């Protein structure tokens, strides 16, 4: 049993995944992801489904130092789901620098159609970052990290991790 209240107060990145891949019983699969700067229309990252045996649950981002000065990014995700209905699909995503919380984002997906491709846009409003923090984040790649916790009907069914470089 892991519910939203169990992650909404976390003050550091988790030392392990909080669920196994097998707990994804709704067979949710991200097949496209794109991030864009809402103030320029620049595409900052895009991946599309066409070893790395944990590719499914860890992603590493290479951004530029300008990324940290953005106001707002729009993320578009496409995902398939299996044949079971999915109700109240929700992601809580928490970003830390050296286990100082930067921001937590709480996104509710729209209605998910079973056995189909689905699409959702997430808008990220950046927190205020001090000059000192920005300088540190640039100088220390991959010490910025995030946990993405996915819930269906208030139960954790996926957990993905990421880290970030701003070293350009």
């Amino acid at each position: 049993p892991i519910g939203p209240e169990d992650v909404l107060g976390l003050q550091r990145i988790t030392g392990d995944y909080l669920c196994s891949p097998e707990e994804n019983i709704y067979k949710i699969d991200f097949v496209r992801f794109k991030i864009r700067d809402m103030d320029s229309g620049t595409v900052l990252f895009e991946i599309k489904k066409p070893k790395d045996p944990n590719a499914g649950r860890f992603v590493r981002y290479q951004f530029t130092p300008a990324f940290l000065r953005l106001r707002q990014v729009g993320a578009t995700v496409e995902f398939t789901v299996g044949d079971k209905p999915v109700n109240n699909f929700r992601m809580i995503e928490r970003h830390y620098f050296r286990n100082q919380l930067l921001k937590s984002f709480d996104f509710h997906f729209g209605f998910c159609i079973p056995s189909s491709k689905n699409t959702c846009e997430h808008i990220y409003d950046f927190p205020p970052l001090s000059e000192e923090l920005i300088s540190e984040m640039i100088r220390h790649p991959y010490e910025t990290q995030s946990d993405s916790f996915y819930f269906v009907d208030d139960r954790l069914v996926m957990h993905n991790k990421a880290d970030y470089s701003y070293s350009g």
């Binding site: 991200f30 992801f33 991030i35 991946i47 981002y61 946990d147 996926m158 993905n160």
Partner: peptide, 6 residues
Amino acid sequence: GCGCSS
């Protein structure tokens, strides 16, 4: 995390 893919 939505940028993950097998």
